[PDB]
C-alpha cells in the first residue's frame, strides 16, 4: 500500500494496566507480553474496537489504550461471550471473568489452597511433589 | 456425425482420455483451458505438445481431455501424452501418413515419453 | 475364544470367527484360504 511515516511521536517501551509493553511490534503481539492475554483474545479485543492491526503499536493513542482497558474488565457487555474467557462459571460467585496479569497467580494460588483445605488427592499430590522436588 | 478421434494417455495410475474432434480449434482440459492448469509451472509441460510441431495444426481440431486418478504432476504427464497421442492419431486416420511421420519425428526428437507411457511401475513390497 | 484348543491368547476377532492364529495356520485350506502369493 502507501508508506506513511511520522516525525517522532512513537514510544519504544510503554506501560498499560501496570504491565510493560513495547511499541515496535504490532498491537496483538505487544499484548501477548502481558500474562493471561494471548494472541486470539487480543485479536478479538482489538478487532471489536475497530483498531487497524496492520499498523504497529508505537502509534497507539491514549484514547485507544483507555478503550482497550475499558474492554478488559467487562468484555461481556460488548459481544465477547462466555467461551473466550478464562474464569468461566466459577465456584465462588457463579459468573464469568477474564483474569488479568496480577490475578492469574491469585487464581492459581486460590485453586491450590482450595484443594488443600478440601484435602483432595490433586492438592496433596501437587504439594507433595513441590515439597519433594524442591528439597 | 463429427469426425472424432479418441486416444488415451497414461502415467502413474492416472489416465487421460483425449477426444480429438473437428471444430473451430480449441483446447479444454476438464472444462478448463490450457492457459489455466492447476500447476502454473507445468503449464509449459502441457504447452510442449503444442510447440513441438506447430501452432497452425490446431486450427481445425477440438480436443476433449478428461483425466482421473493419480495426483497433480502425473495428471500433467497423462494429459500431455494423451494430447500428443490423439494428435498423431488424428493425423494418422484423417490426414495423410507423411504429415504424421513429421509429427512423430518431431515428438521423438525431444520427448520419447510423449508417445509411450512410463516403464517405472510401482515395485512389489518384496515380502 | 478359540473353540479348538482352549486358546485364550493369539485371537483374531475378524468376521466373528475367534480362532487363534496357531489353529488358523493349519485350518486355512479347509476353510478356503490357500497360499497363492
Amino acid at each position: 500500500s502507501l508508506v506513511v511515516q511520522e516525525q517522532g511521536s512513537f514510544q519504544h517501551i510503554l506501560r498499560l494496566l501496570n504491565t510493560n509493553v513495547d511499541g515496535n511490534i504490532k498491537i496483538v503481539y505487544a499484548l501477548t507480553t502481558i500474562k493471561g492475554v494471548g494472541r486470539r483474545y487480543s485479536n478479538l479485543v482489538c478487532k471489536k474496537a475497530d483498531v487497524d492491526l496492520h499498523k504497529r503499536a508505537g502509534e497507539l493513542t491514549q484514547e485507544e489504550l483507555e478503550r482497550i482497558v475499558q474492554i478488559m474488565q467487562n468484555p461481556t457487555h460488548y459481544k465477547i461471550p462466555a467461551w473466550f474467557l478464562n474464569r468461566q462459571n466459577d465456584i465462588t460467585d457463579g459468573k464469568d471473568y477474564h483474569t488479568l496479569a496480577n490475578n492469574v497467580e491469585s487464581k492459581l494460588r486460590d485453586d491450590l489452597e482450595r484443594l488443600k483445605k478440601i484435602r483432595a488427592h490433586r492438592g496433596i499430590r501437587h504439594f507433595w511433589g513441590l515439597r519433594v522436588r524442591g528439597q | 456425425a463429427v469426425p472424432s478421434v479418441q486416444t488415451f494417455g497414461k502415467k502413474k495410475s492416472a489416465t487421460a482420455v483425449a477426444h480429438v474432434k473437428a471444430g473451430k480449434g480449441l483446447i479444454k482440459v476438464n472444462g478448463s483451458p490450457i492457459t489455466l492448469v492447476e500447476p502454473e509451472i507445468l503449464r509449459f509441460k502441457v504447452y510442449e505438445p503444442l510447440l513441438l510441431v506447430g501452432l497452425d495444426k490446431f486450427s481445425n481440431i477440438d480436443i476433449r481431455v478428461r483425466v482421473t486418478g493419480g495426483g497433480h504432476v502425473s495428471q500433467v504427464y497423462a494429459i500431455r501424452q494423451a494430447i500428443a497421442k490423439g494428435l498423431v492419431a488424428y493425423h494418422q486416420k484423417y490426414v495423410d501418413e507423411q504429415s504424421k511421420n513429421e509429427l512423430k519425428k518431431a515428438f521423438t526428437s525431444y520427448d520419447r515419453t510423449l508417445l509411450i507411457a512410463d516403464s517405472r511401475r510401482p515395485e512389489p513390497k518384496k515380502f | 475364544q478359540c473353540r479348538v484348543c482352549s486358546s485364550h491368547t493369539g485371537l483374531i476377532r475378524k468376521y466373528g470367527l475367534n480362532i487363534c492364529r496357531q489353529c488358523f495356520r493349519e485350518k486355512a485350506n479347509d476353510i478356503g484360504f490357500n497360499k497363492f502369493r
Partner: protein, 143 residues
C-alpha cells in the same frame, strides 16, 4: 464463443466478486463475523476481517457453478482444516458448518443458489446470468 467462469482464473474471479459484493452490499451480515473462526482446524482469525465473508461467498458460488450441487460436508472437506494438535501431527479436519450455512442461506436469500430436488444446493438461472456477466467484465478488465 460464450463467456463463463470456466475461462477465467480463480483468484481474480474471487477478488472481483468480493469487490462487487463489497460495493453492492445486498447480503445478510450477522454480528459474529468479527468473532468466528473459519473452522475448528484454524488457530488464527482471517486477516481481511471485514471481507473474508464475501470471499467465502465468492468461493461457495464458484464451487456451486462448477458441479451439480454440494452439501455442507462437501464444503467442510473443501476447506480442509489442518490442525497443529500440539505434539500430535496434522490431520484432515472438516470445517465449521455454520459458516457454510450462513453463506448459503444469505445466498438463497438474494437469489443465486437454490436447493436442488436431489437434496443439495444448485445454481439458479439468475446466478448463472450474474456469474457469466461478471466473467464478461472479468475479460473486459484485461483488454
Amino acid at each position: 464463443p460464450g463467456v463463463s467462469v470456466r475461462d477465467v482464473a480463480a483468484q481474480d474471479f474471487i477478488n472481483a466478486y468480493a469487490s462487487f459484493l463489497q460495493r453492492q452490499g445486498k447480503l445478510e451480515v450477522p454480528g459474529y463475523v468479527d468473532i468466528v473462526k473459519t473452522s475448528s482446524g484454524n488457530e488464527m482469525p482471517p486477516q481481511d476481517a471485514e471481507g473474508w465473508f464475501y470471499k467465502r461467498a465468492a468461493s461457495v458460488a464458484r464451487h456451486i457453478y462448477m458441479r451439480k450441487q454440494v452439501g455442507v460436508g462437501k464444503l467442510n472437506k473443501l476447506y480442509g482444516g489442518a490442525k497443529s494438535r500440539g505434539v500430535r501431527p496434522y490431520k484432515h479436519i472438516d470445517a465449521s458448518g455454520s459458516i457454510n450455512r450462513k453463506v448459503l442461506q444469505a445466498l438463497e436469500k438474494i437469489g443465486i443458489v437454490e436447493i436442488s430436488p436431489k437434496g443439495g444446493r444448485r445454481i439458479s438461472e439468475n446466478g448463472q446470468r450474474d456469474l457469466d456477466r461478471i466473467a464478461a467484465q472479468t475479460l473486459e478488465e484485461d483488454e
